[PDB]
Design a protein around this ligand. Structure first.
Ligand SMILES: N[C@@H](Cc1cc(I)c(Oc2cc(I)c(O)c(I)c2)c(I)c1)C(=O)O
Ligand SMILES: N[C@@H](Cc1cc(I)c(Oc2cc(I)c(O)c(I)c2)c(I)c1)C(=O)O
Lengths: 116, 116, 116, 116
């Protein structure tokens, strides 16, 4: 699993289940191409979004639907969403893990770049 | 000042200076349309973006150019940029303070929403 | 001024009002002895803890009573309290600014040291 | 195991390897009595800190040595160390992952209590 997304709820202190995460990849036209899509499992992580061969070089946008997650719980959050825009595989084949900590009025995101 | 962005460097433990900040107010045709622009002062705070008269009930995008701040220092950051997207003033004249803590492979943004 | 302390609430998106704060400097006996106390204001801070003359070089510890804060709102937080142990005025006189973003199960604390 | 720990370097975007970890347990006579200890693995995880029998109801403190981690890298951190004081196993038997994101002048910790 080259690309991975890990999401947590800071209010309840557990994994953020069913959070719609959308992965786009840039284009020469500078428009966004829909690379992948999925929702986070009961563990709060969405692995198996892409494969080594398919995850080529480029700029990717990982967009997390935080507003929908909260609205479901009955809370109206600040952000409409939270996205992580980065340049992947520039140097070489690296395995990424994107983690995000959620709160109504704050969100935190860290990455963990690792060799295969 | 109903909208002020605050940015702090978490590696050197000081305010992030000269960080480019771009604000975009969503237009009626659903296109991100330029609202404000500026660079964080020496205190890390960027003020004087707009006024309440022209800070209408919409969806704004405060984009902080973190990539260039870090590259200037000689470091190579993970994120292309940090982006906060939210629906402002959808009730009444609220004052919005949006702050962000920066780290090369991590960052988090909080929002303090008050009113005079 | 030398020991400034802001405390935010990442759930309600506002400053944390009346959050107890206890500071302790390390005594020559390696035990923790009292130094200053007070509660955060409406703006979410306490600016009158000590003054240069009393804020000598040593090992300090700002303890923030997070437990009691979250217990009033009805919530049952994970931590008993947020602590920040650090060495003060090592490089001569400096002005410190501790800060914590509070959330039920997760807290974050940044430190900003500026020179007079 | 029932008590797992995680440290993550956010300056380099990698797991924090060889970080000292010391767990304490609230004694009966209100003093910090040693409970368990170890060092983080290649993945940044520290497992087998305690059995599913020693971890009885009490007030545990997890001290993560931040100071030496940064010193070794040439960096001059702000904090002497990260601490996580919490109450465990009062609602019954629980699993506790305790994460920490590090930066020279800022650290963040989150708890993920899972139910067996
Ligand atoms: N392989 C790892 C996966 C893992 C990573 C993080 I990172 C995490 O929790 C946090 C803590 C903080 I602090 C953050 O800012 C964010 I985003 C997520 C959790 I739970 C699990 C393991 O399970 O051991
Ligand atoms: N040096 C400042 C103090 C200060 C620093 C930060 I950085 C900050 O904003 C955040 C945002 C997030 I997201 C965090 O996780 C944290 I911790 C702090 C705020 I408000 C105040 C002064 O005295 O002016």
């Amino acid at each position: 699993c080259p690309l991975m997304v890990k999401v947590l709820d800071a209010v309840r202190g557990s994994p953020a289940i069913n959070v719609a995460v959308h992965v786009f990849r840039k284009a020469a036209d500078d428009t966004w191409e829909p690379f992948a899509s999925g929702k986070t499992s009961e563990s709060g992580e969405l692995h198996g979004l892409t494969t080594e061969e398919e995850f080529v070089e480029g700029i990717y946008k990982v967009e997390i639907d935080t507003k929908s997650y909260w609205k479901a719980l009955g809370i109206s959050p600040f952000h409409e969403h939270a996205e992580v825009v980065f340049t992947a595989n520039d140097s070489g084949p690296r395995r990424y893990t994107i983690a995000a900590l959620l709160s109504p009025y704050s969100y935190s995101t860290t990455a963990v770049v690792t060799n295969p």
